[PDB]
Amino acid sequence: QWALEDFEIGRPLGKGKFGNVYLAREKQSKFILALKVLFKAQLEKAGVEHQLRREVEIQSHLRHPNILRLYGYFHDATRVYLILEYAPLGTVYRELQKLSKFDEQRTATYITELANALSYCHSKRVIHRDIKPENLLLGSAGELKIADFGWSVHAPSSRRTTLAGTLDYLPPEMIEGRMHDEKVDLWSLGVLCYEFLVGKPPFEANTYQETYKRISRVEFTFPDFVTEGARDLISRLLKHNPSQRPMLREVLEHPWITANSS
Numbered sequence: 001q002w003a004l005e006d007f008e009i010g011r012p013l014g015k016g017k018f019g020n021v022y023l024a025r026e027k028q029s030k031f032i033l034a035l036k037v038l039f040k041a042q043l044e045k046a047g048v049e050h051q052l053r054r055e056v057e058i059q060s061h062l063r064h065p066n067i068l069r070l071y072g073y074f075h076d077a078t079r080v081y082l083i084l085e086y087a088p089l090g091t092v093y094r095e096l097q098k099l100s101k102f103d104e105q106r107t108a109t110y111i112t113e114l115a116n117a118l119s120y121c122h123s124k125r126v127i128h129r130d131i132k133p134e135n136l137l138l139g140s141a142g143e144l145k146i147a148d149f150g151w152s153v154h155a156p157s158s159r160r161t162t163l164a165g166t167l168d169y170l171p172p173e174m175i176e177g178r179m180h181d182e183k184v185d186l187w188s189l190g191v192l193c194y195e196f197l198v199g200k201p202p203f204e205a206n207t208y209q210e211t212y213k214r215i216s217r218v219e220f221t222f223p224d225f226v227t228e229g230a231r232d233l234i235s236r237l238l239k240h241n242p243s244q245r246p247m248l249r250e251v252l253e254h255p256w257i258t259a260n261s262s
């Protein structure tokens with residue numbers, strides 16, 4: 001069906017290792033959307049051309065208000081085109097840059113949305129979404145959208161590289177090279193809850209090497225303003241042992257979440 005001729009192209013919203021994301025508009029409907037362009041040369045060089053095919057099929061069947069929708073896709077001789085939902089308010093990472101840190105009501109509301117999205121994902125055996133805030137977008141209603149599909153893409157305003165942000169969110173079992181399961185998403189939720197409340201991710205260090213040690217040894221501390229309920233949820237999510245991490249339904253029922261979420 002689709003071809004590049006079906007779209008008007010506007011400015012690049014961001015750029016990544018594999019290509020760019022453009023503001024775009026379907027000509028007939030004048031619908032605004034995000035056109036993600038991946039260069040086949042880059043996909044081939046990295047050896048991920050088979051992984052892209054699988055994730056396109058997965059993404060084509062994920063339908064949830066807090067997951068960025070894939071409308072369709074096509075290709076030409078040099079490029080793959082993903083026709084994505086456009087999230088008009090940008091990344092949560094940028095919101096965090098602007099506000100420095102989130103209050104407990106905003107944080108608990110965002111965590112609720114993500115826990116619901118991740119529960120849906122898990123129900124389809126979809127695990128390990130990279131939910132660093134650079135991959136979380138804000139829809140027109142301010143609702144969170146998981147948008148890690150098709151690899152990282154940064155806006156010009158970003159000050160954290162793809163490798164650094166992804167490392168900040170990696171769980172000990174994947175740094176220690178062990179088997180992992182869907183509990184990696186619970187770990188990521190704890191890192192995110194902390195970054196939301198603090199304005200910095202908990203294991204940030206000068207070097208990647210020190211960050212590895214801090215993650216593996218779960219070495220993090222709380223600023224004085226983090227309330228006891230927030231400490232309790234974050235401490236349960238950032239357990240080294242994945243079996244000790246709560247179920248997503250237990251996150252949603254956590255007293256700090258229910259007391260503060262919209």
Ligand SMILES: CNC(=O)c1ccc(Nc2ncc3cc(C(=O)N(C)C)n(C4CCCC4)c3n2)cc1
Binds near residue numbers: 091
């Ligand atoms: C001052 N305005 C802004 O910074 C702004 C930035 C993006 C949007 N919309 C928007 N909509 C859909 C997307 C899909 C991606 C993407 O492939 N990611 C891996 C996440 N991205 C990225 C592009 C670069 C930042 C997120 C999307 N971005 C609106 C406003």
